[PDB]
Amino acid sequence: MLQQPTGGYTTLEQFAFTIRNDGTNATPTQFLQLLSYEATENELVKKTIPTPETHLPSARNVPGNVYIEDAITQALFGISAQNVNAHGYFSRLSALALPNTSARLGLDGVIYNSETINIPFYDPAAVANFAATYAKLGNASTPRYRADMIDIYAHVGLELAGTDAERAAGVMPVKRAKFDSWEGSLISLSRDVVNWKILAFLIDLCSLEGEALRAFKTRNRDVFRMMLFIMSTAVAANVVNRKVTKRVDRVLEYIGVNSMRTAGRTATITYDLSRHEFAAKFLQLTFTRWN
């Protein structure tokens, strides 16, 4: 029954987000330094983000317990081909949104009906606010509710590849980002970033207050710029790798502009139609909370 000192569960060594590359294991901060980019002249301008709709879906009665956490990641950064998922037990979340409920949310990423014996879980009070915002992710494919899978991506590219000199004006030149690679590359970061404990992050966003939110956003604006990069190569138009003499570069076509089908096919992670609606519903919901 862990608690947060307002440092948050992210101020802990229990679960930390680390990519493995370079023959040893490294933190996200060290990785991003390799991403160097130029310009190709198609101005990607920051639009406004429309507020979400308050109505929460109903968690249709369900016996047993689903791994609510699993699906959140298994859709966003899921590597292995994921079939249609617009359907599913994806809104049991809202059953935590009400005041007095007994249903608890454990560590590891499960949603128990009744707290059982020997299972460590997040604090029942700070998991409430996380739900009154993310249980709203249940209606991701209901017509007349789904977000728009175009404009948010403009917001995304201004984040992982936008030098501050640009974001302060709200406009930037479309970039083509290439870092140096190894073998599997793009697919390897996916099989890696999947098992990260995303819930250990999102809970902090909706609780931690201005004192420990300005400090929280400063140490974690990088764990965000990591699960935002992989989520981006699932959109880019090309992945062709340039060649030096012995070196290899993974030029990525157009980060921040959204096409409709993956450049990866075989080389990188791939999305599906049912997932395009999903990524837009996540990316929209999370940005208001972050920004």
Binding site: N113, T116, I117
Partner: protein, 49 residues
């Protein structure tokens, strides 16, 4: 040509059968606007459902 032998001899049949030994749960439906099962569950604090 049925209703008489349907709302007399057959009516006193349910009227008694409504209160037997093994009939217990309420399946009443006189207000389709508002009625629910109100089911119970066998649960232990040590992981059972």
């Amino acid at each position: 040509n049925i209703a008489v032998a349907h709302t007399d001899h057959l009516s006193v049949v349910y009227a008694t059968m409504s209160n037997f030994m093994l009939n217990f749960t309420n399946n009443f439906s006189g207000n389709h606007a508002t009625f629910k099962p109100d089911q119970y569950v066998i649960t232990s604090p040590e992981g059972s459902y």
